[model samples]
Target: MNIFEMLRIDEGLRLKIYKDTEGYYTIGIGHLLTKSPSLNAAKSELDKAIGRNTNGVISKDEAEKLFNQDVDAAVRGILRNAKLKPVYDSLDAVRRAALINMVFQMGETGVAGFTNSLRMLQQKRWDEAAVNLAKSRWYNQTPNRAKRVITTFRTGTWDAYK
Candidate 1:
């Protein structure tokens, strides 16, 4: 089964993808609440989001659902014409999930905003990555949830993975 199919995310999770009262459609990871339409769609949108932001791939149809046409175009432009290529060279599935999940929670700029964290990751600094992970606005806003996710990134423990 596909990852979304494995996750059992249908309309229930789909309902969360829309904008909330706070104007943020946070991506739910494990027990965290969000407005993601479908885990599959969310996953796809998130992947595209990161790819578009980092100049990896530029699929407009894949990204259109998550962003408006103009904004989507802008995102594609960011990917297509950025000066500094984003560091997405060597990430495992879990790390990719963690990064995409966080970006889904924060937004492209918000995720890319992690200057020191990205630098640390670029240097293969795991501990520093974890530390920088904990130092973001996301970490501050969602400490409990962020800790849980970061722990997965740090240890690869089964407790949360399951």
Candidate 2:
């Protein structure tokens, strides 16, 4: 599946604002509204995504489009980071999707901190990269999701979706 669908399943689609695990105001498949200048700005952005006024609500298709946009930003964010581009380009489709999922969930800066893991990934040391990822606080924070992403790294298959 595409990163958009993968994240739709993983992060989930929310048409309205809701608190994420850490209580940040978020909307439309994990878009962190707190990152915006204000709630009004976030609403305006959402309005633009919906291509019309939505107040604080959005249609599912609009949510999907917004989610795709967010995932695209995450992909670009990774590619722009000097340390990440090589590792990202070295992976096959599934593993690349997994990397984008990680960046989408944790933010590029957070994934950027996975120094050893990135090195292992660049070397195609799959199991070593998986092990390093499992050692992170991100793993501890969301064990279920982490296991699937780590398994994707290790096995290079989407079997984790099972």
Candidate 3:
């Protein structure tokens, strides 16, 4: 099988904006956010590429391309943000994935606002960081997801959601 097919199997293709595991708007294989300029720009480009409608739907093939680009941008954004870089680099894979997910869900600026949480993360105080995450408005907005992220930060496991 081709690499795109393999990656697509894990990422899961979607053609429209839908609520993700965390209830945030997402589309095209985990491309998060309905209002993001990135999503909009991708949609515009997809329209040009395939002559599709403006309703934000695109082919699975199109989604695969966008997903790769979006994921690269997300990772780069997480790494490039001075405030999040140290914490991102210092954390284990599970914690790093959790942080990346948070950035994807809330955007770099939104995630950066979690000053105390970031401090706790940088200090390697997972429990404190989790608690700080739970104290935010994001928790209230998506308790289950917030809990899962907190649990991952605390335990470095993927079992929190299930």
Candidate 4:
């Protein structure tokens, strides 16, 4: 099942599901917690709630603990649905993954906002694309990740691995 399906969002739960990764609360579609609880229990309750809320339309969160797993999943989903690998195929795996990470952090709309960078990439102006990437808001907001990605794009080295 898909991630959205895993959420199991009912109309009642859909409006109620806000983004909160912390605090001890019995999370369900529409029900609120009456008391604080353990994090694991809360997560489990949320999983069940999402399952019931979405009517089994959604799948469960992945078991991978790494931060990049989310980005990898998003990239895989995009590649599967968009069928546009050549645009990404020119890039090395690390660079591609970095761009995927950016896209995952910033939604599609947000990534689309990088007009200059996108243009440069599509035009095969690799240097310009790297520069534009560095100039992006993501570079400012997430310097470490963004810098590493920009470097990969420019130098073709997976600097983050070092």
Q: What is the per-residue lDDT of model 4 for residues 1-162, given as tens digits with 9 covering 90 to 100?
A: 222222222101323223333332422232333234554554555456444443223332322222234445667755763433444666655556555645555545676677677666656787888877887656776576566657666665554435
Q: What is the C-alpha local distance difference test score of each model?
A: 0.48, 0.83, 0.71, 0.50
Q: Per-residue lDDT of 1-162 in model 3, one digit per residue for the tens?
A: 222332343346678756666554566877654444465665665466446665667677777777677667768998899998988989887778778777766789999889889999989898877877888788997776677678878998766643
- After superposition of all CA atoms, the RMSD between model 4 and the true structure is 10.8
Clashing pairs in 3: none
Off by over 4 Å in 3: 1-13, 17-26, 30-55
List the candidate numbers ranked by TM-score, top first: 2, 3, 4, 1
Candidate 1 has an lDDT of: 0.48
**Per-residue lDDT of 59 in model 1:** 41
lDDT of 2: 0.83
The residue-by-residue lDDT of candidate 2 on 11-98, one tens digit each, is 8778897778776667878887666546787777667666788888877877777777888899999899987888899989999999
lDDT of 1 by residue, 112-161 (tens): 77777777765667887898788766778667668766765676442443
- The most accurate candidate by TM-score is 2
What TM-score does each of the candidates earn? 0.51, 0.88, 0.73, 0.52
Q: Which stretches in model 1 have alpha-carbon errors above 4 Å?
A: 1-85, 156-159
What does candidate 1 score on TM? Answer: 0.51
State, as a TM-score between 0 and 1, how close model 2 is to the true structure.
0.88
RMSD for each of the candidates: 10.9, 2.3, 5.3, 10.8
